Write a protein that binds this DNA or RNA. Structure first.
Length: 132
RNA sequence: GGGUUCAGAACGUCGUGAGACAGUUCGGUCUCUAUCCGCCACGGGCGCAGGAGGCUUGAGGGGGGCUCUUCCUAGUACGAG
C-alpha cells in the first residue's frame, strides 16, 4: 500500500472520459482520486491541463518531446487571456466541466496519500513532455 | 549508307563444268540552282463609302499546362504488433 501517483498518457489525441475514469479505482481497484489538474482539449486542438493547487494553466505545444516545448503559464483562472488563448466556450467550458471536478472527487491530502488508501492523480502525455 | 540487292575475291557447299545457295566474309560513285501548291518569316499595291498623326477594342489564332523528394500535422483515425 505504498504511494503511487496517477498519470494519463495520450493527451495528444481524444480520450474515452475523465469521469468514469478514476471511478473504477473505487469499485475494482479501491482508491480515491484527487485531480490536481484538468484537461483543456483533446486531439490536435489539445491545450494541456491546469493545476488546481496553483490556479495556473499550462500550455502545451504540438510535436515536441526531445526539446520540451517552451513553457507558458496563464495563471489567472477565468481570466480572459486564458479564455482567449484556449477559446471562450472551451476555457470556461472546462470551467463548467471543471466545476464537475468539485463534485465526485476529493481534494489533495498528503497524509491519506501515504497512509495508504489514496493516490495523487496527474494528467499529461509523455510523448509531449507536457505533463511530466 | 552500317544491313541488302552489280562487278573482285574467299570458305563451307551443290554442280563433271561454266557457275550457283533470302548460307556465310572483307571490299565497293547518295546527282551545287525550288517554277507550282504547302510552310517560316518580310515587304510593295489598293482597299476600310472625308485628308491625316497616334494611341487602341479584340472577333477570330497561336503559346503554355508537367512532376519528385523531404519536413508539419502524426507516431494520431486504423492496428495485438
Amino acid at each position: 500500500d505504498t504511494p503511487i501517483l496517477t498519470f494519463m498518457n495520450k493527451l495528444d489525441r481524444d480520450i474515452r472520459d475523465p469521469m468514469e475514469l478514476l471511478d473504477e479505482v473505487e469499485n475494482e481497484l479501491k482508491i480515491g482520486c484527487a485531480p490536481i489538474t484538468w484537461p483543456i482539449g483533446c486531439g490536435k486542438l489539445f491545450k494541456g491541463v491546469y493545476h488546481l493547487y496553483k490556479d495556473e494553466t499550462y500550455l502545451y505545444q504540438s510535436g515536441k518531446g526531445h526539446t520540451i516545448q517552451e513553457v507558458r503559464i496563464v495563471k489567472g483562472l477565468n481570466n480572459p487571456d486564458l479564455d482567449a488563448a484556449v477559446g471562450e466556450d472551451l476555457a470556461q467550458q472546462l470551467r463548467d466541466e471543471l466545476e464537475l471536478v468539485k463534485g465526485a472527487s476529493n481534494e489533495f491530502d498528503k497524509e491519506l496519500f501515504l497512509a495508504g488508501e489514496i493516490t495523487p492523480v496527474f494528467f499529461g502525455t509523455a510523448l509531449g513532455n507536457f505533463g511530466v
